[model samples]
Every structure is written in structure tokens, then in C-alpha cells.
Target: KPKLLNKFDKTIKAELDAAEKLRKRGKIEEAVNAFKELVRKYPQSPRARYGKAQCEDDLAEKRRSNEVLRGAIETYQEVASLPDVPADLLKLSLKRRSDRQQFLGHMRGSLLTLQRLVQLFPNDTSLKNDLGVGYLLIGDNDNAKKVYEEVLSVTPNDGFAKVHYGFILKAQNKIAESIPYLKEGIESGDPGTDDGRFYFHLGDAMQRVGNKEAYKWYELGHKRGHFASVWQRSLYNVNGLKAQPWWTPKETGYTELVKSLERNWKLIRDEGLAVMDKAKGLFLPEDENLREKGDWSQFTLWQQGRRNENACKGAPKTCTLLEKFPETTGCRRGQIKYSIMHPGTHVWPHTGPTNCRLRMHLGLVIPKEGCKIRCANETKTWEEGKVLIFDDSFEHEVWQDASSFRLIFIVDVWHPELTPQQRRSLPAI
Candidate 1:
């Protein structure tokens, strides 16, 4: 039913219609001015006040200025509070005010407004969800949990409720209890559950429980494009091959290769050291761990099996030294770089993406002390002119506290267990 308007003189009715037409035609400022004049003349008229509030709301949206938004909220509140205001107008005012409050980070005020709205429309699940989020943001987890539980009771497959509940539980260190909720949320087939955070939380819970299946979950999360920072410390196997934190040279089919590099270490060292000052420091904007640790720099000789032509062209001696190593098809498909860690540098703990590759470090220059690499549970120093072999997939960190630089020739090799067919299919998988 149309809202009953109080009788107004003919002049006032003509002015009110003109203002509404201006508002409908997108002349927001003009409409607001006209409505404000009518509101000033007829302060007790609900219809005039409602039109003024509506014009203010439209003007607020057009300007997107904080002051304008606040003005709109105030007008709407006044109209909504007025006696005999239409229910529909009141609801619109309340909802718009709550939305603006939430956007402005006035979470408590938004919560109060939304709570009132929910009381008026008890079956509005979306409103309840917003209310629950408000509680969570304010650290009222107890209330948040109850709200979600109530939502679940009515809609068991509510993905947002499940994921948020799982997150709250995880925050409280209830990993075991959070897993079921997170799993259900991810598997609920709700488009909303397709978020990467859900898979990450589920994987984290599985890993905490010592479940090897955590790797599969982590892989799923990664596939969904969420790379959790802690993922680098978790063990991940390739083609069902378990990761060995520390590896022997014979295991990698690189024993002779290590011997060759060791014999010519002096040549490689001199050439690499010559270019140390010219190499650019490595910077990872997306990896906070690296940024917080200290300076880590590298000189790439080869990347993804292809030669860094410019770098090699500038450092011919280093390139010649690299030529001594056998460039088999497997080796050609790997990366080779001169990695340099400066004094005070710390490489935070992280895991590699796959176990299909074994990593080797040929020590060129080593500090007498304060330089160490830890892989899984083992910590060791690099011996000058010797090679260190390990599975980078295991959690590892490096600390270079020596007064000088620590340099190594790093190489990657295919895992011994990978068959020719498996190697070909690995990339796609």
C-alpha cells in the first residue's frame, strides 16, 4: 500500500513532485536542495522527510565523500525515527546506514544497527551473517560462534558459516576440532567455499595431526592459487617418492659431478668472486620472510636449464668453468646459480614445491664459523671445495653470521626414482 501523505497546499505538492523528478533524473544535488527546502518548511511531514533522506542517500553515493556519507546517514536516521514513517522507507534507511557504517570500520555501531534489523526480520540469514562477522571482528568470538551455530542449525550446508567457524576454532588452537568443519566447507560444493583459505586451513589442520595426507591437501590449496607462507616447511613428495632431508651424492647420480666441481673449485671461486660486487641482490616482494631476514643475493648462470646469456657473456671465465660439468638432458633441465648470502643474513624456514628434484651446493667460499644450513632436523656447515646434498622439499633455513660473504654454486637434479615417463609427465601434473 502507498504511504499516506499529509495534506499539503497545492504549491507544496507541486514543489515535492518537482524534487522527486529531479532525484529520479540523476540531478542528485538539485534534488537534495529542493527536498531540504520542503523539509525545512514542513518539518513534521513524514513524506517530505522521507524524500529528503532518499535524496541525501543518492547524493552521498554520487559524491563518495565521507562527510556526505555521514550527512546521509544522519538524515536517514532522523526520517526513520519520525512517527508514521513507512515501514519500507525505515528498512531502507536502516540497511543503508548499517552498510555505510560497516564500510567505515564502525563495526560496533554497524553490529547494533544490524542486530536491530535482525530483530525486525528474524529470518534474514544474510543479516545474521553480517552480525556474526561484526562479532568476530570485535573479538567477541563466543557470540560469533553462537551466531554461526544458530545459522548452521537452520542451513547445515552454509559454507560461509562453516569456514568462519573453522577459522575461529583454528585461531583458538583447536586444530583437531576445526578440521571437520573446514573439510565440510570445502566439499560442500558451495561456490563460496572455493576460496583458497579454506583449503589452506584444512591442510594446516591435517599437518598438525601428523597426517601424510596433508601434502595432498596442501597441493590442492596451492592449485587453487593460495601459497601459505608456512607451506615451505612442510614435506611434500613427488610421484609417491618420500623426501629425504639429507641426500648422498651417489643417490643423486651426481657423485662424479661433485668430484669434478671440487677439483676445479679454485677456478670457479675466482671467477664467481670477481663478479660478486656486480651481481644484483635478490628481492622478493611477495615473501615477507625473506624481506624480514636480511640481504640475500644471487648470480644466475642458468635458469630452468637455459643459460643466462647476458650474465654468462659478461662472466666468460665462470661460464667456462660451468662447461666442465656434464650437461646431460636431466642436468640441462635444471637450474644452476651462484648463491651469495651476506653477513647477518638469515634465510627463514621454508619447504620447496616438489620432491622430484634434489638440490646440491658446491662450496666455493666458506666462513670459519657462523655459517650453517639446516634441513629438517640436521644442521651442518659447508666444507670448502666440497659438495652438500639435500632434498630442499624438507624444511630448511640458513644463517650467515660470519664477517664475510658465503658463496656456493647451487644445482638442481631430477630425483633418481623418477622414470623417463614420469619425468615427462611431472610438469603437467
Candidate 2:
């Protein structure tokens, strides 16, 4: 149903011919200008606008210029909006617009434009990839994955789409599933220079999947000395670990309560030691800190005890080991407030009353390497699920690492020498 290009009126044809001649002669800028003039002279002619857009595109690519591409897209958009433009030409114009929008960093606009193009031409693989990219740029990894999956479903060999999908999976920590996709993308002849980003992402996925060779690709990209590698190195320096923090699984110590507690405590101890090893010049600005007072040291708990307190004023509670948990029972009652240091910050060392209570800590959220508690004679570290039981009354203090928060589940149990009367009086609750 579309009209033939040759059927255009003589006047339009002459302008078009002149424009084409100028373009073929390599006068791209002049040809583009002439095409624009022809469009202005024949605004009602669809070919005139389309031809101008084509000329703009040629000039844009010829000059490697976004501004020129934008001009072309604008011309195409205007023509596409007219009722006379053919459906195929409109589809082409929309695709160009989507690309131009992306080039201009208007990601949202690019996405919407490409989405419309996909709806108009649902079978188009290239447009679908563009949509996936738009989702990725905006941090919508889930949706990007879906789009890439759909692309692969229709055309299983689409390496470009597979690469993008793999990137989404990697970002989401699904490394195993990301491997084949990234490999395919690399083998598909996608430019190593332009596709270096995929390689970097692939390397991260591979690292998580326990692939030591990931370092090779990482190094490949790193050695090229791009800005991304510089940032990655800086991250390594801050965290002191190349891989993501290794969090012991919840089941690691689930077999026995004591084993669990001990396992968790080991993490705290090791983490504390690690911090001390790295604290070369780490200074605490707080003057009251034990570090500041030159009294910083570590110790072990010699004794501990738990006593019942009232839930409501004058209401009695129990504090003994029992299988049944008691209601409204304050069996474990202990309190620590800031002396020179506030409750939320660093406190210096002071000795405890006995070694029985070893302060047990179950960190809910420990900030960076700053949490340190010294007991009888040794330093203790703290981390999530890691417990530190030390004598509370012993001369001890806590120094929370710089700019990091330290919260823990602090509890007290019975001392070894509690009389039968005291034991009987304190119920499990």
C-alpha cells in the first residue's frame, strides 16, 4: 500500500537528486544542509523529510558526532509523526530515536522509546536488547534479566543479549548461571575493548563461583588501566579482602549450642586480631578512649552471675537455668553505661570483679574493624553472631572502630560458686 519513491513529483525528485549527488561527492555537511533546505521547501512531501533524515544520519556517522545524530533523529521523528510517513519508516525513525536518546544519557527516555518500538515490532531482537540495556542502566536487574531471557528464548544464539543477561545475574550474585552467558558473549565476536565491561562483570561472577582464573580477565581489564580498575583497587585497600566478606553459614555451628557459641566466638576473636594487626596509625579522636589514655590492653573473664529483676516495679522475676522460658522474667540483668564515653561510643579499659562472667557478646551489627574489648589479659573482637564472654566487673573497656557501630546481645549467667539457695531462688525465666 506504500507509495513508490520514484512516484514523487518532479520538484521533490530534483531536490532529492541534488542532495544525493552532494552526499555521494563526500560533501556530507553541505549535503545535510541541502537536504534540510529541501525539506523546508517541500514540507508536505514525506520523501523530503525522510531523505533529510537519511542525510543527517550519514553525516552523523561520518563525523562520529552525537549532535549530528541527534539532528538526524529529530528529522526522522518529525517525519514519522506525519500521517504520510510509511509504517516501516516510522519504525526506523523510532529505533534511531531510541539510540540517540541513549547516546544523550536520557536513559529513561531511551527505554520508553525502545519499549514502544518493541511493541510495534515485537520480533525485533536488536530493539529488545536495547530495552534490556536501558533496564540495566537504571539498576533494574530483575527486569533486565527477564528481557534478556525473552530475547534468548526467541533466538538462542543471541550472544549480545546473553552477555547482558549474565551481567544481571552476576550483579544479583547468581554466578553459576552467569558463566555460560558471558562465555558466549565473548566468543560471539563482540569487541573486547567495548565488551571489556562484560569481561569485568564476568570476572566478578567467576570469582564468586570460586574460579581463580577470574583474576586473569580482571587483570586484563585492570592492566589496560581503566578508571574502573582503579576504583576496584581502592575498594580492595579499604576492605583488605579481594573477595566479598566470607560469612559463615548459619548451619556451620548448629550441631551443638556450645559448639555454635564457640564457633561464633572464634570469628570475633579472629576479627579482633585482624584489626589489631592492621591498626598501624588508626587514631581515636575521643580523648577519653583507653587508646588515648595509654591504658589499652586485653584480659579474660574469671567469673559471672545472673540475678532476677522486676519487669514492672515491685514485680519479682527468676534468674536460673531452666528448660522452660519464663514470662516477664528478668533472670539476666546487667547494665553498662558510658563513664567518660557514651553508651553508643568507645569506652576505655577497667578491671572486672571476677573472671566467671566472661562478657559474652552476640553482635547484631558490628561496624568496621573498630570493636575491641580487653579482658583479664587479652583483646577480644566482635562480629555478627560472634560471642565474647568476659568478666564484666574486671578492669575493662570497649573501643568501637572508627565510624562503625557496635550492637550486641549481652547476657549474664550463673557463677560457678552460687549457693543452692541463690540457685533455687533464680528460676530459668
Candidate 3:
């Protein structure tokens, strides 16, 4: 069986051509205004409305405004569901709306839209692949696998389905089962292969399976602008933040804050010790991969610029002292927590997400001669009530061979070079 798509009549086409020209060469609002006029003049036509919605999409991206993006989702649905809209336009409207819905936290609606697209065009490999991706949005790996499996059965050469199905297997922890499919699907050089994560996933799969060539893929991905660099790969970033692996208190313009926290380190330590003594579960392990050998744990006071109510409640005086320093509490790009390193712990080498913040560890309890942190080329040990500052967006690791546990109150401040405007405007981590 074959599909024939209906085309918009010549009038709508002419209007679309003119609006698209403005969209390409003129001010985006100029284009948006023209498209909106067309949408008003032709209520039943999807082409101009599609242009309007997509221009809003572009505008939102330009401004990094999630609110604007959420508004456009309604318009996209309106145009997509308009009666007699051509299937070509219908599919485009449905597909993009599905993605927008997924991006803005409506997974159920996003899945429904994709399901509708697939229902209308059951034999379309692309729509079916999109449905598979929709399943992935909800973390329903089994359903995604089923959709991709059906796609591969019907069209074995579909690289998109193969790559995604491989991802499903990867998510299921079937690392070896995913390897060849990821490798071949990426090599297929098909549409949608430009996503840099495909290469990273394949590289990760290779590395996990003890293949030494993993760096090759990672370097390639770095060149393709995926990872921040070959080793520093967290994507949340702002371009102009200073990037050295370490920082000094005076240079950060926070020497007073540093001293303030340092002088109060005893009080903070006492509060933390009291909380730890009384609380059963406030401290939790570090992320699994990051803690290679240690019993590292964290107790949060603030995270992503929000007070952890329970944590603040437990460490009441510590939170009160912290609230006086807006720089640390308001630094949405980073966190404030108590980092405890149990004896004999080691953290793997890693980098943080962005150069926008500098990390300070104000030592509360330090066991001499047995604990050290290496950031880039420098290695240093913490001294009680002293602060060591570093930029976490560089290669760093930790080790503690002490018999006694080590504790530090960690504060992350916005990078000194960042503008006041950027501190407010940049998306929080």
C-alpha cells in the first residue's frame, strides 16, 4: 500500500512562501506578525498557523523562555487538529507538538499525540519511530522496544529505529546486547544520527564492556560539540565563565564570605554533628559512579537555590548562618551541603556541569595527613576551619586514607566573572 498526501491550495502556498521568506531573512517578529495575519484571515488553514507556532518556538529558544514555549504548545495543537488539514501538515504539526509537549513536562499528552500520529499513519516508519521515542519519554523501555522491534521487522534498514531500540537495550542494562546495534546504527549515517548522544552512548557501552577505544568516540563527539570536552561533558553551561581548575578566596571577591563561614565552622560542625547524631537518614551516599571506593555521604542545606526545608529544619542554626550569605544560597547553578568522607574513601575523576560556579569546602573536621583532593594538577589537603576553593568544572578526584572521618561544609558560589544579569537569567542546574 502507498500513501498520497493532500497539498495546500495555491493561495495558502503563496501566503506561506511570502511568510517563509520573511522568516528566513527578516525580523522573526516581522515574520511572526505576517503569519499571524494569515492565520486570522484563514481560520481553517494550518500552513500559516504552523508558521506562527514554529516562529514562537524559535523565539522561545532565542530567549530561553520556557513560558513562551509552553504557550506555543496550545497553538500547535489547535492547528494540528483543525479539520481538513493536509496529512503532510498534520503530521508535521503533530510531531513538533509532541516534542514540545515532551520538553515542557507533559509526558502523557506528548505520548497521546504521538500515539495519534502513529494511529493515523500506522505504516509510516518515521511516525512509528516517533512513537517509540514517546515511549522513551515516559521511561517505558519495554514499550519502546516493542515499537522499535516492530519497526525493524517491517524495515530492517531503518537506522533511527535500530539506534533507539539499541538505546532501550542499554537502558535495560543489556550493555553487550546494545553494542553492535548502536555501532551499526550510527554507521548507517541515516537521518537523526546527528544527535551526539548516540555516539556517547555507544562509547559508554564500549567502555563498560572493557573496550579501550572508547575515547575515540568521545573525542569525535567532542569535535561534534556534544561533550564540553573529551573528559568534561556536562552540558548545562554558560560560555564566558572562567575555567581554571582552582580558585583563591581573594580572587573570588568572597574572602569575607569565606572568612565568615570559616570563623563559624565550629558552630556549623557542632550543628552537623548534632544532626547526624539524632537523624537516621538525612545523609545519603554520593552518586554511585562517582564514589569508586568511599563511603561518601551528603547532607543538604540548599540545592539549586532552594532551601531544603527538612534539612534546614534539622540544622536550624547552620541554616540561619547560611541564609546571611545570599551568594551561596542564591547560586542556582550549584548546591550547599555537608560532604562527609568516611575513611578509606575515593571518588572517581570527574567534572561538574558548568564553569558558572566555584566550589568551596570549609573544613569542619579534618584528620591530618591522610586526606587530599586533586583538581587538575594540584593536590591539597583540608585543614580544620580553613576553606579550599576549586572550580569543579575541571578534572578532579578525592581520596581519604585517614582512620578518622573528614567533614566539610560545601558552598558553591556563582563564578566571580559572571555578570549580575547572568546570575539571574541563566537557567539553574
Reference-based lDDT, each prediction: 0.73, 0.54, 0.83
lDDT of 3 by residue, 39-145 (tens): 66877777767878888887788789999888778788887767677777778877888988988889989999999999898888989988888888888888889
* Candidate 3 lowest-lDDT run of ten: 1-10
TM-score computed on alpha carbons, candidate 1: 0.49
Q: Which stretches of model 2 miss by more than 4 angstroms?
A: 1-14, 23-29, 54-72, 83-88, 190-194, 215-429
- lDDT (C-alpha) at residue 45 in model 3: 70
> What is candidate 1's lDDT per residue for 322-344, written digit by digit as tens?
66654422443456777777787
Q: What CA RMSD would you report for each candidate?
A: 13.0, 21.1, 5.3
Better of 1 and 3 by lDDT: 3
- Which 10-residue window of candidate 1 scores lowest in summed lDDT? 282-291
Which residue pairs overlap in candidate 1's backbone? 232-350, 232-351, 233-351
What tens-digit string does per-residue lDDT give for candidate 2 at 258-364? Answer: 33444454443343333335641221233332243322222111111222232111111111211122111122222211111212454533333232222345554
| Model 1, runs deviating above 4 Å | 1-237, 278-288, 320-334
